[PDB]
């Protein structure tokens, strides 16, 4: 036998919950003994999840606010970090659209296999690790921490409390820093800005949030748990069993058996308060980018919970200039941070940048061929003064790093890559 | 017992070989009976592989030339077709860098799992199929053919003839139209524009081209087979056993057992000639974008095989404006076309478009937050006159197509997505 | 543009629904035109799905009955067919237990990723195809059909109607012949012999059966659709919306909002009758093997639907000796077949055979080392008289088939595998 | 900003290499600073790989010998440990045959995707972890260590030194304890007991072993590195470049350029000695299970390398009773153990166990239906005396464990699985 990965005792775990300020405003309805009972004889260490979660928590407290863009590939996350961004957002919508394990293009309705997001978390972490390895051998100290924390989409958990548990565990195994969970019926899940949304009862989402925390505790990592409510626009709910939901129930039913419910900020606020003890961050989806509406939500929840941090989705599902002038747009995130919205993210940033940049290049290329590509390459060259490095694509993906591996195994290797390359001679 | 998928007879196959103009200049050193014995009692129909290969072959003869850009995600290929391109190039380098089944970022050295490119082939077809389905329910006739032919990188085959066979079979099952195969040692494979390259003997590559043809024949599809030679810059070869290679052997050997060999256009020309009976297209990697060297290579091959189509890599591994003036860049592809270069491609187009667009957005975002994203969204709106559609990301990704499935199953469904979406109300 | 895989006209499909006996007893609530609307410009052929479904249907009408054993690996399926079986069962329980895409061991509660069963379907077809390729090379006419139809577990569809649709589509792409769908809540799905089952409303299961059929129609293949009811033991239902369900609802609720419902054969019979127009086979999960209960169910259904075929789970979750005697155990399937149970299967056969054989082997090995193994080898030699071939393991996994590919490419290869093998010299 | 996962200093690594008896006679031709240079800013902890490798190294010394059977599924490994076995062997031949990521059935020729064995390593560890978790909840302490060390097949590394590096790294991420590497040309790899084998030069294999050690060092885990030579039967070698290989070169060549070499125990002992400073265990492939040949190989090695442990493949490719008597067969492993073979394993145990046990059942089932199955269920019942537990399949697979998760999350949950089960009532 062995002591490696020996689980902590329940008293040690209790001590930590009582001692670490991380757990100041955090309610667990299960016991430390319950956690240990689920741990077996060996607890795998999850370095990147631990490191990420701790970094993320400090950033939410140390910065004015943390903003992120949705990344759907590893290289996308690398560029975000290279450009000075300090956190990464992993969008389930983007995974459905262009990066899931079925191989298919889907709308955002939880259609893809449930291990799809964990795979992209692991991909993003691998890509940042490579960027980190390359920087080290290059003596590049331009970025202090390549392993920026990742906050990923847990959707509606793909089923019940057990599905939620397995997803959080998978996300942790892959190195996630934070995960979010929404109070929608999993079998009818929608993007927050699609219609046809169905809520589940308040208590059912507390079970989800409890389940997400249990998985993190059993995995012995301080995963940041975010609760999201879709009650601003959802006109349906699965059941009227929960007394907290009954005030918005209208009596009318649909043919499927769903109850109609009165949507808006009011049930969002009540839901936020109920989730607060079980959420590190709280997020309500909205129909418009509106600062007053955000202030309204923020005030009401902080009245009850002064230190409860909030999250906001600066969604590309909004037509921004339709609703806001350049001046409000420019100050949007700053104002939001003043209200307690400490995590802010553009969910579909990667989808749009990728689709637009390839459309633009392919269109020019269709008309003018190489002239069109040369314009991009020249922009890349120009971008180097900003810190862009990917013009030299070979070193960017690690040709220099694997040369070092190769010469470590055999210094006189005849088959190394960078020496004699066009990159060496032309860039 | 059934007659679904029953194998043809050798006689039928032979007739096909004798009379189909597709096979005019194709040498097969195995028998039609050999093919049949490999087919068991059922042959699966590969619709996309068949359709793609037939469309590709006609475009090569119908169009002045077929050009393409490297796609590494499904959405990229969609935007390329939407912008008017008629074929998709699937780059092994890009798969190594940002889209392979290990989840890691790699340089272009055949490090990733051998089913990686096939998986991307299937993804790209899935994505094109989605765009096709959406076009049909939207009444969108702007794109003539959504299922553009995919030409994919078979690298050095990941081993010997059998690994080659299995890779070609997997590409076909995934629906590939064409595949290219290079005369390097698989265990030391490099991007053409990296150094450290090791050639295999001429006959070993003829064996590769034979295996790739054989897999296509057994799968019963007219897959376009592309032969690539890396002799312009490789200074090593695994063996001097082949008399056609001996004139360039120097005599010196490395510690690995590799022979030094004289690189340049001369051994490329000879190899291209030995490969011609086994290749629908021939491609030589070169160190610069140069019409004269292209002309030189084209002239010499055509003098011996007048109907031999060629392929040219318009590589991002070149510093284009360091080597050419804007006038020469503007005419490059049409000039190449005139010489017989019928398939032309920018291998790493995807990697650069993706990396540069995200660096630029993230950089802007870091300084201006929402102002930076809105500039992109506005550029997207502006692009609609050119044919861009992804600004409406919900329908782009099939929300309307799935709503159609939903209402087909249940016309009274209360939970369809687009009705009441912010997309519908703001776009 | 091309003719390959062009979709049929609505008129043509209608013609088939009208005139093909296959659809005699089949209700479709959507139209032929709805099917065409969803097929885009190109319809992929699915040879193995078509062949298997056609073959399965014929067998259901020819043989007294069709039985099968649950297979979780490809070799297992190969051996089942070798041993003379005519169909393969693909258990979701077994996939959860030992063959799903998360890599984890799960209980049967829809915990694993939704593309796990399609991947095993594809695996089993690949394995059978290799067995079929090898036979055609060894001139083995022993087995008449290596491509036995596969019937696969669709569970509760992993969510809503769209999740169901996507599962069926992926099952078909992998070459499934038939699929079964059960009337449970997916977020709380259970093995039928587990407790805590929650039913869905009758109409919701008709929605599922409809979705499964629609995916088959869109994919243009006559997949066998199987309807399963879990009403014998389930005491919970999600809603009281459906009038057909209301007679069993007690009026008592749970804290989650579920409704208590009266379980037993009576609701199973009512549900079966409701599912009948949408199901090629109907299957009632039961708590004990009981020829009497089976006849009761069988007679009640046939009274309304005389030609409705049924299916029966001979479940290892039963203690067979606690309930029955040797004489009846021997007649069991034959008697069921006379009541109209035309498809019969042992769900967990593979789990038990694999787990037991390995335990027995390992146990002996621990105390007796090589003696224990040598014994297994002897039985394998013995079993050769009954048709077993796996003792010559090299040729069993295709060493000779691949040698043939190798010599097809190059007859003079010095790197063939079987020549010089210890299989050639010791066997 | 974090110090979690900060790598050790060169000096600390150096100290471990100097003083820790683990690294006693281990040559590393690279430096401690070379290792650190490759580690980036963060080193991920690999709990199961560290634990397994440490445990395995101890067992190899504390125990008389360590023996193992090839496992190819997770359940298979659980039954091996349950039966008292102390280590698990992961066969590449078995992955090729029935458990690789292409989904196809293959002969043992390195045809499958290179990440296939790592996936089975992860699966096996997951399976053992589940069993550990259940046993802890059931108070079963009959197995002291559920997480038995896993020794895995690295084959010929799927290419060059960098492919070896990545395979070893993936094996470690998955939790491997040891890995073996053979001196064949990957592009022509064969199972040891097939023919058509090709050796690579001695120094090339040293490169392989050095790369495998480097990956383990960079990953900071004491992975057990095993070298295998295939020189006993191989009559071919890629090159005559290595002077240690020249004595066996005959001078004859093939049309492929390979060199004919004299096979036998002679080059095996020479290669064993060359590999010894780079291998924790040495393994020689034999034509027959002969104790005398093993004595001859062993003695020759210990005379120069006294502490060098050895490994032996008790292979099903041998017809065992065709060579040995029941008296020797029974003493075989004990005898080998004396000679210095502390690791012995049956490569294809799982294959034969699986294929036979399922052919047996399916064959009975085809004649006798349910009678055949109950025969099996009766044996499983009979085995609960020896410790067999899979009869109660629900608990075996985690039903009780997930019930505990469910009740921890919500003690009032009315949808738990075991209460009301047939397992709770019939077993
Ligand atoms: Mg989302
Ligand atoms: Mg809180
Ligand atoms: Mg390439
Ligand atoms: Mg099932
Ligand atoms: Mg092996």
XYZ file of C-alpha atoms in Angstrom, chain C residues 62-238:
177
model
C -39.867 -16.116 -40.348
C -38.249 -17.730 -37.322
C -40.445 -18.921 -34.455
C -38.584 -16.279 -32.496
C -35.436 -14.147 -32.528
C -33.211 -14.225 -29.458
C -29.996 -12.453 -28.517
C -27.487 -11.805 -25.782
C -26.244 -8.368 -24.717
C -22.852 -7.654 -26.274
C -20.554 -4.923 -24.932
C -17.477 -5.578 -27.099
C -17.035 -6.378 -30.770
C -15.351 -9.714 -30.097
C -18.382 -10.719 -27.960
C -20.720 -10.048 -30.884
C -18.437 -11.964 -33.226
C -18.591 -14.967 -30.865
C -22.350 -14.762 -30.475
C -22.714 -14.942 -34.263
C -20.077 -17.661 -34.559
C -22.096 -19.688 -32.030
C -25.093 -19.458 -34.368
C -27.045 -16.463 -33.038
C -28.989 -14.337 -35.494
C -29.163 -10.979 -33.687
C -27.193 -8.849 -31.248
C -28.551 -7.011 -28.215
C -26.810 -3.785 -27.178
C -27.544 -3.111 -23.483
C -27.374 0.422 -22.094
C -26.836 -1.042 -18.623
C -23.681 -2.736 -19.874
C -22.465 0.447 -21.570
C -22.923 2.288 -18.241
C -21.151 -0.537 -16.441
C -18.105 -1.153 -18.602
C -18.188 0.470 -22.084
C -19.088 4.171 -22.150
C -17.346 7.283 -23.361
C -16.776 8.841 -19.942
C -14.458 5.978 -19.048
C -16.271 5.564 -15.715
C -18.197 2.661 -14.202
C -21.857 3.687 -13.785
C -25.155 2.258 -12.590
C -27.959 2.212 -15.146
C -29.231 5.778 -14.717
C -28.494 7.587 -18.023
C -25.288 8.955 -16.538
C -22.922 8.333 -19.472
C -22.487 10.523 -22.568
C -25.335 10.143 -25.076
C -23.177 9.006 -28.000
C -21.856 5.984 -26.053
C -24.315 3.448 -27.447
C -23.885 4.598 -31.074
C -20.124 4.098 -30.705
C -20.593 0.499 -29.515
C -23.069 -0.094 -32.362
C -20.383 1.086 -34.778
C -17.775 -1.074 -32.975
C -19.916 -4.194 -33.175
C -20.518 -3.629 -36.898
C -16.797 -3.128 -37.500
C -16.039 -6.353 -35.626
C -18.642 -8.340 -37.594
C -17.318 -6.835 -40.813
C -13.815 -8.097 -40.018
C -15.178 -11.561 -39.210
C -16.992 -11.376 -42.562
C -13.844 -10.239 -44.419
C -11.789 -13.024 -42.889
C -14.351 -15.699 -43.789
C -14.393 -14.619 -47.458
C -10.602 -15.057 -47.433
C -10.497 -18.387 -45.570
C -13.285 -19.649 -47.833
C -15.440 -20.125 -44.754
C -19.145 -20.498 -45.553
C -19.910 -21.701 -42.002
C -21.822 -18.555 -40.948
C -24.411 -17.438 -43.514
C -24.777 -13.871 -42.203
C -21.975 -12.239 -40.229
C -23.803 -8.917 -40.288
C -26.449 -9.855 -37.713
C -28.922 -7.076 -36.962
C -28.166 -5.031 -33.844
C -30.957 -3.942 -31.502
C -29.772 -1.095 -29.289
C -30.841 0.536 -25.999
C -32.083 4.116 -26.576
C -32.825 4.511 -22.879
C -35.107 7.477 -22.276
C -33.476 9.428 -25.109
C -31.273 11.590 -22.809
C -33.729 14.469 -22.650
C -36.455 15.802 -24.906
C -37.763 14.930 -28.367
C -34.667 16.495 -29.992
C -32.282 14.440 -27.852
C -34.232 11.367 -28.891
C -33.997 12.450 -32.511
C -30.235 12.854 -32.349
C -29.712 9.492 -30.592
C -31.680 7.656 -33.254
C -29.815 9.427 -36.029
C -26.476 8.470 -34.477
C -27.646 4.890 -33.909
C -28.540 4.743 -37.601
C -25.265 6.273 -38.807
C -23.501 3.536 -36.824
C -25.582 0.808 -38.527
C -28.213 -0.098 -35.937
C -31.145 -2.289 -37.029
C -33.601 -1.449 -34.266
C -33.826 0.675 -31.130
C -35.899 0.697 -27.977
C -37.330 3.654 -26.102
C -38.761 3.645 -22.577
C -41.378 5.859 -20.909
C -39.263 7.142 -18.005
C -38.089 10.609 -17.030
C -34.549 10.802 -18.433
C -33.163 12.908 -15.520
C -34.179 10.038 -13.228
C -33.853 7.078 -15.647
C -33.382 3.655 -14.043
C -32.697 0.080 -15.004
C -36.177 -1.476 -15.058
C -35.380 -3.673 -12.051
C -34.074 -0.765 -10.018
C -36.356 1.177 -7.673
C -37.253 4.862 -7.801
C -38.596 4.958 -11.362
C -40.565 7.982 -12.585
C -42.906 7.664 -15.562
C -43.553 10.303 -18.176
C -47.063 11.092 -19.504
C -48.364 8.728 -22.204
C -48.395 11.453 -24.848
C -44.810 12.334 -24.070
C -43.758 8.774 -24.862
C -45.759 8.870 -28.074
C -43.732 12.029 -28.832
C -40.559 10.024 -28.293
C -41.702 7.144 -30.487
C -42.687 9.667 -33.143
C -39.292 11.387 -32.947
C -37.493 8.021 -33.277
C -39.551 7.175 -36.354
C -39.005 10.641 -37.846
C -35.233 10.383 -37.518
C -35.449 7.006 -39.257
C -37.576 8.480 -42.064
C -35.245 11.465 -42.535
C -32.280 9.061 -42.691
C -34.347 7.083 -45.225
C -34.097 3.679 -43.467
C -36.727 1.249 -42.098
C -35.369 0.982 -38.544
C -37.371 -1.216 -36.151
C -38.807 0.979 -33.378
C -39.404 -0.702 -30.019
C -41.616 0.737 -27.259
C -40.925 -0.170 -23.634
C -43.137 0.638 -20.654
C -41.859 0.817 -17.087
C -45.344 1.024 -15.566
C -45.342 -2.399 -13.840
C -43.159 -1.186 -10.964
C -42.980 2.623 -11.252
C -44.972 4.443 -8.546
C -44.235 7.939 -9.757
C -45.158 10.065 -12.785
C -43.998 13.622 -13.607
